[PDB]
Design a protein around this ligand. Structure first.
Ligand SMILES: [K+]
Ligand SMILES: [K+]
Ligand SMILES: [K+]
Ligand SMILES: [K+]
Ligand SMILES: [K+]
Ligand SMILES: [Mg+2]
Ligand SMILES: [Mg+2]
Ligand SMILES: [Mg+2]
Ligand SMILES: [Mg+2]
Ligand SMILES: [Mg+2]
Ligand SMILES: [Mg+2]
Ligand SMILES: [Mg+2]
Ligand SMILES: [Mg+2]
Ligand SMILES: [Mg+2]
Ligand SMILES: [Mg+2]
Ligand SMILES: [Mg+2]
Ligand SMILES: [Mg+2]
Ligand SMILES: [Mg+2]
Ligand SMILES: [Mg+2]
Ligand SMILES: [Mg+2]
Ligand SMILES: [Mg+2]
Ligand SMILES: [Mg+2]
Ligand SMILES: [Mg+2]
Ligand SMILES: [Mg+2]
Ligand SMILES: [Mg+2]
Ligand SMILES: [Mg+2]
Ligand SMILES: [Mg+2]
Ligand SMILES: [Mg+2]
Ligand SMILES: [Mg+2]
Ligand SMILES: [Mg+2]
Ligand SMILES: [Mg+2]
Ligand SMILES: [Mg+2]
Ligand SMILES: [Mg+2]
Ligand SMILES: [Mg+2]
Ligand SMILES: [Mg+2]
Ligand SMILES: [Mg+2]
Ligand SMILES: [Mg+2]
Ligand SMILES: [Mg+2]
Ligand SMILES: [Mg+2]
Ligand SMILES: [Mg+2]
Ligand SMILES: [Mg+2]
Ligand SMILES: [Mg+2]
Ligand SMILES: [Mg+2]
Ligand SMILES: [Mg+2]
Ligand SMILES: [Mg+2]
Ligand SMILES: [Mg+2]
Ligand SMILES: [Mg+2]
Ligand SMILES: [Mg+2]
Ligand SMILES: [Mg+2]
Lengths: 101, 88, 119, 73
RNA sequence: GUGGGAGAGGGUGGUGGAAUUCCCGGAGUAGCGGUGAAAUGCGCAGAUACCGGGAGGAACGCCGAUGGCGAAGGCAGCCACCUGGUCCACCCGUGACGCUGAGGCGCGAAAGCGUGGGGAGCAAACCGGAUUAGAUACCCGGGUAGUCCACGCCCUAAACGAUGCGCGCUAGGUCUCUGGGUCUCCUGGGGGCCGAAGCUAACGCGUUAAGCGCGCCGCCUGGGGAGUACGGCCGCAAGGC
């Protein structure tokens, strides 16, 4: 049971119904792997620095979670199956390192 | 890994007395726990040699501590071997 | 016969030859030139003067399509790159910007023995 | 000698391990998408070593570029 | 033991972009390429240069360093999991449990061997072009094994700090990595430079000793013959000890 952070970049061209279905599948897969959610930050569509999937923008999602480590990798694969989901990055949570303090 | 609760479990299990954290029995028990964990790690990932060296070092240390216990008090030596199930 | 009136200019400058390709803003070429298009045949193509001739010839070929303003793009470290730059800079064509887009790899492929002692 | 300005001194309080904050990490990239050296950032060894991995994370996420094109050459 | 720390330490899976090659399309014309100069080569079956899309393999630019990690070989995109080593603070526990180490056992860059796979770039052999008095070379155009992966062999090296391991003692200055602290600085571990005493044939070494000591292992006894012969052991072979 460690604390992780999930970054999900998906298609910015989705309407509200398809986006709701994508997020429903995300929540369902998180429940299926026992990932308690501590907080969420939905930043919406943003301008990428380079085109991803031939699209110059991307819709961002961020989830600070806590889950068993042994299936973390096994969870990430499940999130990459959806064609609308084009970027998935899971990172172990770390305390912030402040500079110029 | 090896969380602190399991470490305290084995320490309080093999403690000669409350407060003892460094007697020979405790050290050999901790080395045995780490050795079994590393052997289970090395059944898979059998191409990992840098950790196999650490396994060799831990085995040597446990053998030397058991030899010291054999020399000083063979009764606690037999008791430790019987409780842990070592030497085959 | 397209009457482009505005496009891009790619300059591929190498130690053996300098070659200019004048394209439209979408990248599709219109005309082009090089040291071999001019009478120069051998090593004289990797010359700054040959690069100037190639740039001016491509520019005059682009004048036939009635083009005025260009966007210059430089690729490759070769003799005569800046000379072709200065040739296109004052050639009747208006140079709007100069951009170096030399393709540098991230240590992907092993170079030839000529370019070894690196990666 | 890079006497123009130091990026750390030209900035305030910020998190070095935050890979999502773009408007701060953009200041640490050069005119190209390259990571600035120590002489430009004015950071220390540990700070630079953390900044490298965080910038790479932001690059993989698509927030920071891998490389850019030089202008006005 | 407790609490913390840094790291390209190792193994497994996944994943990212730049570039090379190839394919598809668009656009487009007479050469590209290459060299001291050239020619082979490729190009009217439309190349080179340009734009877009796709496939595949291999290596990870900036960060990056005089840096870090490992016992050595060696380790460099990113993420996750498994895992080794190590350092510091507290002075908590055991109570000499220590050092070295003939054999044994394991690891061991590259090249090479076996089976299967993969094969973009590079490239022994080889096919050519040049150069040359000749050119079985350097230079140029191609190109197979190989480089890559899995499993199993092979045990070599300028395997180098040409300096075995451990401990104690013996001026400092400066740079740096990484902890701790009363954080001008002090203290501890690691990487550099200059240097006290001292050592050395000299060069140079000098708290990271090649100084002063102690313990243990390895090895040397003129050069060629020769790391050859014989014998043995190991190896599928090449061959190694
Ligand atoms: K010809
Ligand atoms: K080094
Ligand atoms: K083959
Ligand atoms: K030797
Ligand atoms: K400090
Ligand atoms: Mg997908
Ligand atoms: Mg030429
Ligand atoms: Mg690592
Ligand atoms: Mg075509
Ligand atoms: Mg060719
Ligand atoms: Mg060819
Ligand atoms: Mg022909
Ligand atoms: Mg024809
Ligand atoms: Mg091509
Ligand atoms: Mg393309
Ligand atoms: Mg293929
Ligand atoms: Mg570098
Ligand atoms: Mg070290
Ligand atoms: Mg080395
Ligand atoms: Mg005490
Ligand atoms: Mg006592
Ligand atoms: Mg030893
Ligand atoms: Mg031995
Ligand atoms: Mg080997
Ligand atoms: Mg090999
Ligand atoms: Mg093979
Ligand atoms: Mg094969
Ligand atoms: Mg080749
Ligand atoms: Mg060749
Ligand atoms: Mg030849
Ligand atoms: Mg001669
Ligand atoms: Mg002749
Ligand atoms: Mg073969
Ligand atoms: Mg050396
Ligand atoms: Mg040595
Ligand atoms: Mg030494
Ligand atoms: Mg020191
Ligand atoms: Mg000195
Ligand atoms: Mg003296
Ligand atoms: Mg002297
Ligand atoms: Mg010493
Ligand atoms: Mg003799
Ligand atoms: Mg000899
Ligand atoms: Mg002899
Ligand atoms: Mg030999
Ligand atoms: Mg024999
Ligand atoms: Mg035999
Ligand atoms: Mg032979
Ligand atoms: Mg021999």
């Amino acid at each position: 049971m460690r604390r992780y952070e999930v970054n999900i970049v998906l298609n910015p061209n989705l309407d509200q119904s398809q986006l709701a279905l994508e997020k429903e599948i995300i929540q369902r897969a998180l429940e299926n792997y026992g990932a308690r959610v501590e907080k969420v930050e939905e930043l919406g569509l943003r301008r990428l620095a380079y085109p991803i999937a031939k699209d110059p923008q991307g819709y961002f999602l961020w989830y600070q979670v806590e889950m068993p480590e042994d299936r973390v990798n096994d969870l990430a694969r499940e999130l990459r199956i959806r064609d609308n989901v084009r970027r998935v990055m899971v990172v172990k949570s770390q305390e912030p390192f402040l500079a110029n303090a | 890994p090896i969380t602190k609760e399991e470490k305290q479990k084995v320490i309080q299990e093999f403690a000669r007395f409350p407060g003892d954290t460094g007697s020979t029995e405790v050290q050999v028990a901790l080395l045995t726990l780490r050795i079994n964990r590393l052997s289970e790690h090395l059944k898979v990932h059998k191409k990992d040699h840098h950790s196999h060296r650490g396994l060799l070092m831990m085995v040597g240390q446990r053998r030397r501590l058991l030899r010291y216990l054999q020399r000083e008090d063979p009764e606690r030596y037999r008791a430790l071997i019987e409780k842990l199930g070592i030497r085959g | 016969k397209r009457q482009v009136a505005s496009g891009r200019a790619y300059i591929h400058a190498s130690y053996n030859n300098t070659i200019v390709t004048i394209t439209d803003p979408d990248g599709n070429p219109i005309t082009w030139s090089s040291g071999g298009v001019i009478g120069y045949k051998g090593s004289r193509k990797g010359t700054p003067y040959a690069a100037q001739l190639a740039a001016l010839d491509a520019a005059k070929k682009a004048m036939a399509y009635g083009m005025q303003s260009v966007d210059v793009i430089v690729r490759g470290t070769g003799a005569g790159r800046e000379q072709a730059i200065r040739a296109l800079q004052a050639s009747g064509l208006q140079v709007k910007s100069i951009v170096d887009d030399t393709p540098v790899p991230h240590n992907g492929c092993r170079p030839k023995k000529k370019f070894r002692k690196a990666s | 000698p890079s006497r123009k300005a130091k990026v750390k001194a030209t900035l305030g309080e910020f998190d070095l391990r935050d890979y999502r904050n773009v408007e701060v990490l953009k200041r640490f990239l050069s005119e190209t998408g390259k990571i600035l050296p120590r002489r430009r950032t004015g950071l220390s060894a540990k700070e630079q070593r953390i900044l490298a991995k965080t910038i790479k994370r932001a690059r993989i996420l698509g927030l920071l570029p891998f490389t850019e094109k030089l202008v006005r050459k």
